[PDB]
RNA sequence: UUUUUCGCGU
């Protein structure tokens, strides 16, 4: 049982290694903030990288979407993209109302436009 | 000197920058945008712009504009104004109507001969009553048709006048104010000013803008004409015309609303125009798809269109704010009444579709009906920059999963192909479970494969398995395209005037510091000017990684041509980096791409049948990958490319992109879009970044590494399938991909088969979005959409097994001189015929395609030949001479009848018919001479009252006899017969055939390449004629001549590559001017082309003499005549050869007699329909599609390693094996093959024999697989239609065993089956009823025995060695000893 | 058999570690290593340029 | 106690793994001997590949 | 037994490979603009040593 | 008018 007790800590430490490797995230090697050179591929723990993204250390187009992706959450934009029934913005609502229904506003004049 | 011949079709970019610069310099203010272009044009204008402005009429127009009488406007506004002409006069209207009536009547008269021949064969001024009724129907053309024809003719007259004058004298400007009423044109090569006096409006445009206006007019004319012909045909026979149908009033109104939208939204209206894809697809889904999918797609389409309209309005208001177009914005923009106009457009599109699958599928021509947007290069570059240089965050588990998926795909491919695991370094990294798979060569399936195994597999390193070619491949390197200059010479593209004085001085000082090769801008010039060239230069550069950190690396950018999406930019690189990229793509294609069958770079109908097939739920996800290139970084696109680098044993070859591109400057390299340099800066790396250029790309470039990105996407999709536990049948093809998701499910209570496929679709879409976000892609709902039973790819619609085509879209731009160089006449006729064949092949309308083709052929012959730019009237005089000759030869009483006969004669004998009758029934034929003779006989049956139902006989009217005599007897003056047969196995020779442009341009190309700095090409050209003589002399002593065996010898020998390069060079715009830095065309080229065209026109005179060349007597008797025998004798007499075998084959159309009922003599092909209905067009049957594939030859590939041999070496080995099989019975064979192997490869005959795939087929005249022999014989009808019928061959095999028994036959049965299927399709087209069965009785006299001959002769080894030594620089890589040693290691 | 089974589990987790670390090695080179001339050290030697070194040594 | 010694040395190897990975993370986000060791590795794989190539060459000869 | 000895003889090799990978990551990530020149010099020295060994 | 411009490709 001595060998088993000796390798139990081996298994625990290996599991910790794998868990923290799973939590590990890597960023792209894009240009620096000053745009005077190229930056190395920053790599680190997920929480620190999220902190850097929020503090604008690493510039990105969509910070909130980055947080949602790294935190394993369904963002509102993603839900809208993959919604069961997509909504209609007011312009599309007006276009749908115009299409569905017989002509009422006339204006069948090419010279008007 | 040299002449500048402009093009009659745009085939290019309507650049925003050129129009902006021209307008800015003309009007002394910002014309289209506040870029640097307007400032630089106003400061230092171009010489062409100054010449355009200094015109007397132009100065008056600018003075009038400055005084304020006329209001400046937009090119799109004048596009709309021209399209709604509403200014034609009565005289020109009646003239156009009369011309159109004449064209229609002549086209029907010409098509009457073909229709009569078809009807006579089938047994069912104008002789056919059907076409008599058609002519009676189409007597008065419709007003929209006259309008479009008049507009097109006016624009084409303006263009042809300008082109002719420009050819006559350089630097000509055409000032026109009478061709179009109320319109003023100042058209020029470098500008086009349009002024409307009545409306007091004026713009400046480009020559490309005028070209695309003319193309809009031509396209709308073609749509109206095709729809009118189809409707008129359907009026008297509903199954005679095209499947789709429009009244064309809706179509004209649709065009008016579309270009009204374009005018109202300016150049940004093409954003709205492009989104019509969504509306058409939604209308199709409303019919096919279920309730939930159709509603979701409809809502998404509405959102996309409205978002595009809002973005277009915002961009337009931002752009034209501080310009000269500030007050030109329509009042409808601000108040938002444009929504009513867009709703009217959409409703009218839906009405035109008329809730019909055929109409909605065919409507796709609307995209090309409107013009092309003026692409703003700087704006597109800014968009791609902001999309590219953005930091992306990847979970390390996700990257490991993707790499492991790629590794698993590679391992699966290696196992399935070579039956073994790849040699991998990290044998200890794998656990015991994977070690078992490594020792015993198997792989687990996806069901037992897991995320854990993908993580494990991501840490595998392999040894070299594939070999880089040591010698550069000139066929895949050389091209006629352009390359970007080096980084230090990037200013050489921009004009001097635009560049600052210090930049001009710097570039003048730096030119002499660069070689002549890299100082050029074209691929051909770059490689021809390389004095210090080396075959082992690309390999050395790749091995040494010379492209890394190269100071002379730059990436140009230019807007994509003829693209409705302005955000399409194509990039160029210097010669070395272009070589590296092309090589990486080529090796990925040859070696890695065949591990990923899901990537179709490989018939679209076929591919789509692949997709035509307690509860298994199926789905469909279609994703657009237009922006998928820019989402890749080194951390994503190179973790998988490192696998390819390791497999090839190379470093940084497949990952060159995200190792070199980030360190260089991405610059818009266009003539009229120069960046602002400033002062004391003479290099891109220090030039500041603005809208004109940017640095640190950090992303992919479209096109380059496209195959790598597609295989990475396939690996990602396989991973997605693993993580979602559903099967994926993804079929990615270039820029669009389709996904077939299948997952067995247990149905819940109250849930049907529907609304569960939707749930699977939603779950799979969520998974796809999450995984693409993890890999680094942010695809939105615009690109991707949801479907249940859609098979959509390459703009093709197919569901329920029925394929709905879009033939009008691709036959849309058919005109006088299309797809031609130097306005070639014969090439134009072939292009017209091929484009009009699309209607028959896809829309299933033989007669509509025939009428359209004859309309445009008659237009080209009798309307545009007298207006040829290069030769003013010589072609028309030659045509008149040929027509008079035909009238004298036959008993024709009218020059119109002579023209009809010429239009209906095959172009092989100097005729005018591009599409012979066999093309109407079977696409491919073994030989063309027999088919041409049969076509000529069938056509001559129109004037001579023969009967094709029975056997050919002899009558009093011996015009057919005279023709068949003039083609069988002639003088024999052959030369270079064997090399000519090697080049073209079906060549006739002795001036009995028309001359191809390459045949005359070969001498000029060799003369040019002789005086070239490149030693390789110089020596190849200098030793060309001697090589030709030696090649002719190699195999002149073989008694039985086999043209296909000669072609195999030609392919095996190294002269093939040199002559292929010569032929590719021969297709350039101007030979003898490549090494002169001029884009004009030499007078020698013009004269040579004119002489070729005149000789080609005046060919019927030589082929059909007025004395029959037989002393005006001894006319061949028609009784007991074999067309196959006659054609074979003509070929042998032309080549002065005792016996030519293996090239002639009986014409199936002539041989197969047609009877629709069975009898005691029913010994024919049994073809019958299986669908229980009268009309089977547009319906699917129960049988498998008739691919028409030829019989596979029998081979025994030896067991040896093939990955260590390159593709060129494998091809050479296969060619040598074919040679050994074909010419085994040769007295000189032993040392002939020994010397051939020693020359081509590094091995001897004995060593090479171990790699030869010995052939088990006794006959090589029936099973040989030359590139000059067809590999399949598909029918004219598409794949889906062939599924409605069943075919049999047992009576034919019985009769062919009774006669010519137990021996191979020259006839091909695949062509017979295709002919029968298309025959019954044509029968139902012409009779509105499908026969129950048709029987194809063969005429046994054309049937000939075809057996392997025993060659008697010796191959001239001296001449073979001379050819090998002279063309020693085009040989493939020699199989070295170090490569041969591992050929047999297990 | 328990010792062998848990040794096999440890081996599988070690393979996990090797895979993740190797993909980190590959993704960590980037264009930054190319300009510094250290990507060859990061990814190691390969057959083609080793053969080039061999033929240079013989020559 | 050879198995016990092997397990113990594996334990120090794992502890070194933790320390080295932690210092790598803090260096990337937040020496001569290591470079020498990695160069010696790169050399030993370069020598194994060269051994394979020379075996191929001697089989050729 | 033999199986245990083989398993440990593979495990220690795996640990050595892991240590090598951590070594190369630490070397590449650290030494900003200073260690790169040393790595380049070590690479050219390794190439010279390989050339000398092949010559010998 | 630094060869009018014209990528990779299917």
Residue numbers in the entry:
A (entry chain E): 129 to 241
B (entry chain A): 10 to 133, 184 to 661, 666 to 676, 690 to 1462
C (entry chain B): 129 to 187
D (entry chain D): 129 to 158, 170 to 200
E (entry chain C): 128 to 183
From the reporting publication:
The cryo-EM structure of the Le10-bound RSV polymerase revealed the presence of the RdRp and Cap domains of the L protein and the POD and PCTD domains of the P protein. In the Le10-bound RSV polymerase structure, the 3′ end of an incoming Le10 RNA template enters the template entrance channel, briefly touches the edge of the Cap domain, and runs towards the ‘GDN’ motif of the catalytic pocket from the bottom of the bowl. Additionally, the ‘priming loop’ (residues 1250–1280) of the Cap domain was distant from the active site, indicating that the structure represents a pre-initiation state for de novo RNA synthesis at position 3 of the template. Most of the interaction between Le10 RNA promoter and RSV L occurs at the ‘fingers’ (blue) and ‘peripheral’ (grey) regions, which form a composite tunnel for the RNA template to enter. The RNA–protein interactions can be divided into three parts: (I) positions 1–4 of Le10 and the catalytic pocket; (II) positions 5–7 of Le10 and the template entrance channel; (III) positions 8–10 of Le10 and the gate of the template entrance channel (Fig. 2a(I–III)). Specifically, the T1U backbone of Le10 interacts with the residue T660 from the supporting loop and K783 of the ‘palm’, contributing to the RNA template stability. No interaction was found between T2G and RSV L. Positions 3 and 4 of Le10 (T3C and T4G) are opposite to the catalytic residue D811, which occupies the −1 and +1 catalytic sites for RNA synthesis. The backbone of T3C interacts with residues K540, R637 and Q640 from the fingers region to stabilize the RNA template during initiation. The base of T4G interacts with residues K619, F629 and E778, all of which are conserved across the polymerases of NNS RNA viruses. The oxygen (O6) of the T4G base interacts with the nitrogen (NZ) of residue K619, and the nitrogen (N2) of the T4G base interacts with the oxygen (OE1) of residue E778. This may explain why RSV polymerase prefers a G at the +1 catalytic site for de novo RNA synthesis initiation, as G is the only base that contains an O atom towards K619 and an N atom towards E778. In the Le10-bound structure, there are twists at positions 5 and 8, followed by a 90° rotation for the bases of positions 8–10.
